[PDB]
Each structure stands twice: as C-alpha cells, then as structure tokens.
C-alpha cells in the first residue's frame, strides 16, 4: 500500500535513512532484492556491507592475521606445535553464521522501529510508485512522497573474456562458497583485489594476482607500491602487467586461464582452482526503468546524478551510496548520508553530508591507512613548492621479538611548506590502520597544524605515536628510517 | 674532564637532551649509573623505559595478548592443538635479548654523536661539577656549564611491612628473573600493579592483586572500574581491600603473606611463590647531595623542584623526567622535554613544554587509553550544569567470530554542554587502545568539537570509528549499548 517514505535497497545507506526517518516518527517502508550472483549465490538483509563486503572480508582478513598470530606466537615463549593448518570450511562458517547474526538482525530493527519490509525487485513506474517483481510473482502497489534510492551496484565482468561468466567468480562468491578455493587467480588491482588476494595467501592458499596496470589507481602511488611490494615479499603470487583473453575448464575441472604478459612475453598458460574478478562494480540502475520515471542519470558511470542534499531531478527523490554519483563508495558516508537525508526531511535539519576528507583503510596483509591528500593530489593542488611532506619507517615493538620483517612499514605525512603547516593528508601503513587513522581524521576535520603534532605528545609505546614523531622533511631528503 | 653539557641519567629523558643537544654541535656528556635493585638485578644504558618498563612490559603484555590470540585462532578455522603451553625462559630470553639490543644501540647512537659516556653514580660536589663512584672506585673530575638532571626513580617499599625486602621482588625483577614467577601476589591498584598483574595472568600464572584502596586512583573511576571488572571478569584472581603486614619464608621457600581483609575479615594468609610491590616509585634525589649544589627540592615527594624551563634554582642547572616535580612521570614527556631543553639552550629555541592534554594508555588486559579530562575532572573544572558526555559499549568485529566477551569494551567522551561543544576528555577501552587513542589526542590539542565529530566520517570496520559515533548522551540517560 501507500507510505509516507519509500527505501529502496534494504543496505547499508538506504536502512540507515529508513530507521533514522521512522525514529522522526515517520510511516518508512523498504523493499530489498538479492538478485544472485551470476554462479548463483545469494544472501540475506543488509546489502553488500554485511553480506559480501565489509563485514565478512575483515573476518577472513582476521583469520590471516591470526595465522601469522601463531608464527610470532612461538618467539613469546607459546610452544604452539607448527605448522599449524586451517580449513576453509570452519572458517567460513563462522563468518556465514555471523553474517546471518545480522541478517536477522536489521530484520528485527525493521520491525521494532514501525517499519514495514518488501522484498521485492522493485522497479519504476513513475513518479510515486514502484512495481515489485517476487521469488513468487506477486507485483505490488507501493507508494511514498519521498523515495530514497540506495541499490548500490555489484561485481562488474569482463567483456570479451570468454570464459569468465562460465567459471569466473566474484566478491560476491568467496565468501560464500563451501568448498576451499584451493588455488587461486585474482584478476584486479585495488581495494577489492588486493584485500581478497590476502587473506587468501594468509589462509595458506597457492594465490596469484594478475595486475594489468598500477596498484591502487588514485591512491598514494607511493603507499601504494609498498603495499604490494609487502604482499609479494611474504606469499603472495605476483603477475604484474597482464590481462585475461581466455579461461578453458578442462577434464579435472581445473581452469586453464590463458593471457598477455604485456611486461614481457606475448602470450602465457596457467591452471587455477577459482579465477576472482575484482575489476570494479557497477550500479544497479538499468534494473529500475529510471529513465520512466523522471530520474536523470549519468553516461559513463552509469550512477544517479545527484545534488548536495542528495536530491535528484525529481525534488522528492533521491539516491545514496554506491548509487550517487559523485560520492565515495564506502560504508560510513553511506550510513552518515542516510541519517542526515532523513533529518533533513523529517527532522527540521539543514546540516549536509561533508564527504570531505573521508578517512579509509586497505586491509592488506599490511593494513594502509589514510585521510586527506596524497603527495600527488597534494602538489597537484598547491604546487611542490608549497608543500612539505614528513616521513618515517618504524618498526612496530611488536614486530621485533618476533621476527617479522618490517621494512614495509611507512609513514607519510603530507601539510602546506608555510607555517603553521596545515596537515592536509596523512598515510599510515602498518597493524591495524584504520584504528590509527581514525584519530587523525579528526585532525583534519579541524584542520591541525604540524605544529600541533610536534605539540601533541606520545603514547610510547605504540604504533601510531610514530605518526606524532614525523620530523624527516623530503625537502631536507634526509634518511627516513628512524633511530632511538 | 670538562663538557660545556652534563647528562646525569642515561634515561630515556636523560639521552634525548644529550643526542640533541650535542647534534646542536655541542661537546656533550652522560653518566649514568644502574644501581642494582635490592634483589640485586642490574641492567644496561637507557633508563627505566628500556630496560624495567615501556618496552618490557609491552612486550610481555604482548605474549600475553597472543595467548588468547590463540584461542580465538580455533573459531577462525585454526586448526591449533590446544591447550598450548608457554615457558617463561623462552619468553623472557626473547624480551631481555631485545632490551640489550637497545643497550648496545643506545651506547651506538652515543659514539657517532661526539658524546662520551662516563657509568658513575654522580653526586653533586658543588655548582659545576659531580663526583664519580664507579664499580671500581675511582672518582672523575667532571665539569659542565649546564647540567642536566634525569636520575628518574625506583620502586617504593613497604615500611613497616616485615618480610618486604626479604623476599619481596619489584618491577625492576619482573622482567629480568631466569625463572618463572610461577605463583604470584601483586601488591598495588594502578597502572603498574594492574599491567603486570594483567600477562602474568595472561601466562597462565596464578596471579592475585592485592588492593588496599580504589583502582588507578585519579584516572576516570569509571573506566578505572571497569578495567579492573575486566581482569577478575578473565582469570585474575582480586583482593578487594586488603593490606600487607608480614611476609614469612616457610621451608619450601614459598612466601607466607598475612594481611588484613579491611573489607570483611580482620586477617587472612595465603602463600604464593612470588611477592609484587606495585606501590609507586620514588625520586632518586637523596643520593645526589642536591643540597650541596644549591638545587632546592619538594618535601612530600622529594622530587626536584622546577620551572616553566626546566630549569631549577640554579638557572644553569635543569631536571628531566621522573625527577622533576610537577610534570607527568611518562616517556613521550621524558624524550620531548629533553629535546626541547637542549635546543632552547643551543638552538635559539624558545617554545616551551606542553604538558597538557598528554595521552597515555594503561596496558592492562583491556588496554585503557585516554586524554583529557575524566567525566569527575571535567565537573570538577566546570560544573555537572555545563557538562556533556557521550558514551557507548562497541563489540569489536573481531571479538564476534571469536566468542571473545566484550562487556567491557566501553567508550566515554567528555565535552562541554555548550556548542560547538569542545571535546575536552576521551576515553577508550578496548583492542590497541593506544593505536586509538593518539590520532585524537590531535584533536584535543586542536580543540575539537563534537561537532567535527559527527562530522568526522568513519574507517568502517574498525574500533576506534565507534568513537566517532558516539550520540547517545548521558543527560539523556538512554541505553549506552550500540545496535545497528
Ligand atoms: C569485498 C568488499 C569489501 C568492502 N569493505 C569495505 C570496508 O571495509 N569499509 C567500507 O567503508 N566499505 C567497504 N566496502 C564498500 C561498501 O560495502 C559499499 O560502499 C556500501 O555497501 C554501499 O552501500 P549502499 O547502501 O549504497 O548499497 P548496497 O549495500 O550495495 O545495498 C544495495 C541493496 O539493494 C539491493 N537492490 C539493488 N537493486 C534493487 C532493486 N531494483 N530492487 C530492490 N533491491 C535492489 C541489492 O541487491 C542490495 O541488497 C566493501 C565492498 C566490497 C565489495
Ligand atoms: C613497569 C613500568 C612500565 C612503564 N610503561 C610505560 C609506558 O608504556 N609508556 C610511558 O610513556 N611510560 C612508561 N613508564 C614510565 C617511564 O618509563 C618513565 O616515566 C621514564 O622512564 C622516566 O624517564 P627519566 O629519563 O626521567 O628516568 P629513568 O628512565 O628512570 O632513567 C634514570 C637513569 O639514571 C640513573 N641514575 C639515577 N640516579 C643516578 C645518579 N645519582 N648517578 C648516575 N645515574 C643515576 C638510573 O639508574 C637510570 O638508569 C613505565 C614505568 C614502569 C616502572
Ligand atoms: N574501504 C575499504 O576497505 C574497501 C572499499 N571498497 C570499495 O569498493 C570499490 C570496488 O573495489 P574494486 O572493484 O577493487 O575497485 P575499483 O577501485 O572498483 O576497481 C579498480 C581496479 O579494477 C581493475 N580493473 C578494471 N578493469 C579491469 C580489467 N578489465 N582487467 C583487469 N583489472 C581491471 C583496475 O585496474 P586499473 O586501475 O588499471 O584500471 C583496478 O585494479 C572500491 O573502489 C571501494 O570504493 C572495496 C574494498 C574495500
Ligand atoms: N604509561 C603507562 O602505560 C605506564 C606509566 N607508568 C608510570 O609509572 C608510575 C608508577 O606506577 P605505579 O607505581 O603503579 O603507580 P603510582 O601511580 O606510582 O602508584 C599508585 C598505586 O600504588 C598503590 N599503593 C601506594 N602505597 C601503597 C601501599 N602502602 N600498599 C598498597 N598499595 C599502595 C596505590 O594505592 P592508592 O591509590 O590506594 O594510594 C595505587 O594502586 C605511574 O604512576 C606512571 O606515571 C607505569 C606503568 C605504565
């Protein structure tokens, strides 16, 4: 029937819209979809954060760590008899069984905050209305004033690839499968890639990356390259420079996946258990008959265009997340953007989302972390001579008795060469970025100076204190490793 | 000889000023002198920090830690053989083999700087010079216009307490024994009764605390409580208000401690194989002859005196660390005050030391981080009426998968009552609450508001993000536990 607000993709953003503007007292309604994947996998409530993302990835991401856990383990006097193994079926179910924890748990928020649940593909109609497909087939006639769209997007395929629907498989699958991936390729060279490429080599699986341009495109080029150069230089299969042309499944059902080392030969042959495609994802627009409904979109990404309040070209609509273009695709803005937009329209708020500045973290095998600028974006925007970047390579207390090499972990923080030195940028790469990071982000909100780090103390002994010890200028290129 | 700079203590505070002040091409020199603990335990160059404290416990915290890291390795798909045992030979070699390595690394970093080094128990003979004691005997004629002062301190005994040096062992033997504590009692309610009560506990040692009052006092009751909550919540065993009175070797050589239930009985024993005075340290001062140099001291503590310069009575003689009164007894301090004296000194450096707002973090169990005020502080300063504090209980992702309990992972931040609403106190308990902790501290110096904390946006999923989430209010009263 009819509501007073409208949500379309029971997510990460669009649940936070829908909760935040029925506490405002308001009649919302949501109707969420998991179209399965192209090998057939599905899930429950919650998009793609709590099902095939952000959730379940740290969880593997941990399982890693906790193996490396058990090798440091032995240097602290734990005589824990190595080597110890690890299967992917215990694993996995504990993360599934959590997943499931909140699945039927925004479920049960849904319901006691007056909210009514549609599962349904939903679809435009037209201006007020949407059609909703079922796993039946039962259409329904719902209808709001105010229509928030949050569908996110999903897992992007290679074209002409032959080979790749047929056996490739997604984000979306490795997390779900109940069987070991055994030996793996990762077709990708970023966030997703990268992250998933980890844990796996954490795991004790024979995986293989397949780069076909740069590491992190966007980021910090420098941190970048360290981060791979971490993963390499403790597991992780490297194929840098190549791409996909053909995957053939043979007798055994292994896959001979076949491509170009642009690098160096023409043309190579290998055989893996499961082929990862973490090229991009892709927005779940066309699926919507936006276009009969009023709502202008973008070419190329094919995203919604979208304003400062998150409105569309219909006033009493609007779009979050993955789905807007413009924004960045992660979790928190798509939270914090929902709560606003719907305090915004029912709650007598004018505060915006600042997507300013928006802190992240790349939970490799070493974690990088960052907020701000990249000396690149930096110069690009002030000039090298008017900028000054502190650096420093620490070697975290921890990482000492045990014996593991930490020639990886570096620090770089980027600020304005004129006093009082505004820090416009900082990129931390070592255990547990994120939980150093956040801090800082703060930092930035407020605009601190390098002044206010060389006036702000240490909690010795730490991690994240190296950050507030930063003095080596790249001006002065002095030797960044750091003594006492 | 004569040095136009005298260092006394070769302590993390006492070193900085002395490698700064001589990379400011000044002829530089230390004596330091480790006077063995009553239990008759000496170590090398590099203060407290080094070789009884900051690295040492860290790095037993941290063996700790990996125990339950274990544990939790099972849920994860770890297919570890428990219950895994730990020797406290291997560890405690692995420790003291890496505090040596910041013996002889200290002792480097003092000959590639034009900096000698005299081991001497100084004492002062006049305005310009100190007598050496040396493990041999022989004195040395040492002179220096600015004479820096970072003898620390040493762990306090009990008074009347008989059976107290006898047997009992401090934070200076901890650390350096060749064999296992095996059954201990710690006599303390503060940090570092509370941290070594914690990996010994940790170990799978039989370890009791023993406190006389309330716990941490001065830091934030609540947080403090909770802390402790979380130890006798996990293995270590509390006695809740009692004292020490008389300790008796019995044949087998295990300590039989009386004491006295003030909370209930009037007296209980019990024995244990190890004793642990956790109950304060005390200046070094008293064996300097201070009063011979014209250096004016405190009564209560008999720490030295001092400026706003770190500079005592004699304008050209200062005090460092530990040693001065006033200043917050941590390392960060120790280092940063040094570095700055030696360059106001020899550098045409004018800024002073800021002792405000330092964090710390209190590496028990549950490491507990902070800076700022404490809720108590923040009413105290100004007024219940004027005061706003926002709170939260987290659940660590990490902590899920592994049926790790996490009623204790609490979150507290104080600010003001009015807009922007300066926050002016944060307080953590949880993982890595340091790595937390010190990216905030920035915002304190910076005078962040909690505004620019809802506006700060979050690296999703971490620990230190639910600080950047606190709403929930306590004038409100609602439920602090976190859903979503
Ligand atoms: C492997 C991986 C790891 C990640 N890790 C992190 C991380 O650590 N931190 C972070 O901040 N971000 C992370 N992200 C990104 C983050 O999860 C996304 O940015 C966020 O989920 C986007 O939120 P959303 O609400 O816009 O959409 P989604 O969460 O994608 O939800 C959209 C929902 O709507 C449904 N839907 C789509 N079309 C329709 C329709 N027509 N009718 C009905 N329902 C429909 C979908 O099936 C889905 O359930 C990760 C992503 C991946 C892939
Ligand atoms: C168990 C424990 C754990 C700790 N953990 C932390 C932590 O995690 N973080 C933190 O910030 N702080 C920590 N601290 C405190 C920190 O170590 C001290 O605040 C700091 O070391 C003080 O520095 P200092 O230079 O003043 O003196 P010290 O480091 O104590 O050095 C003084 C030196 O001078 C010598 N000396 C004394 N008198 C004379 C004399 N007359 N002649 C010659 N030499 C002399 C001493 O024997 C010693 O070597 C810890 C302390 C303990 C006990
Ligand atoms: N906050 C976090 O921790 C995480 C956030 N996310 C979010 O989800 C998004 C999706 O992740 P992801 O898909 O990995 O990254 P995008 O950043 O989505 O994808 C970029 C990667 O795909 C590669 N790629 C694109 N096309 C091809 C192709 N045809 N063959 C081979 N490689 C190709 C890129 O190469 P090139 O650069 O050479 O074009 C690059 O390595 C992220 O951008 C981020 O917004 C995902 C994981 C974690
Ligand atoms: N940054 C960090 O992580 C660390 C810093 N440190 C520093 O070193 C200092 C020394 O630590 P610590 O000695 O533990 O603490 P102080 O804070 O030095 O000592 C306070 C503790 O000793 C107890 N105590 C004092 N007298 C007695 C007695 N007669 N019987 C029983 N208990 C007694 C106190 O009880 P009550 O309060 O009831 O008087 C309290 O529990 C710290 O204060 C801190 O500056 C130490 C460890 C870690």
Redo the contacts between chains.
Sequence with gaps: QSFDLLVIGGGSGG??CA?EAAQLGKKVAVADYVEPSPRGTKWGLGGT?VNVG??PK??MH??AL??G??R??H???????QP?????????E??QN?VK?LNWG?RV?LQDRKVKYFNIKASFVDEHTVRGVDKGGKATLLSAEHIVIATGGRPRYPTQVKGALEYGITSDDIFWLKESPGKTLVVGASYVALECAGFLTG?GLDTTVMMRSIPLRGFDQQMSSLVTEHMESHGTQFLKGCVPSHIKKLPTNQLQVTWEDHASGKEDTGTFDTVLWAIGRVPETRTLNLEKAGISTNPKNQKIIVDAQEATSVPHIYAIGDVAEGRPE????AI?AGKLLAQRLFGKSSTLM?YSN????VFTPLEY?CVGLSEEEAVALHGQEHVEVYHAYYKP??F??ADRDASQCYIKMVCMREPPQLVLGLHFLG??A??????????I????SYA??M???????????E??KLHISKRSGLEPTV??
């Design positions: 649940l936070a909760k954060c952000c959730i740290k969880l941990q399982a906790l193996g856990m058990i440091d383990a240097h602290y006097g734990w005589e824990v008899a110890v193994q690890h299967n992917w079926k215990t694993m996995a504990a993360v959590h924890s925004h928020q795991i992660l979790t928190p803005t914090k600042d928006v802190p992240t973290t972390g207390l921890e000492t008795v255990p547990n994120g939980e150093v990071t956040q801090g800082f982000a703060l930092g909100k407020c605009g601190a206010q780090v006036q702000t103390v240490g909690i010795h002994p730490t991690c994240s204190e950050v507030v003594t006492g």
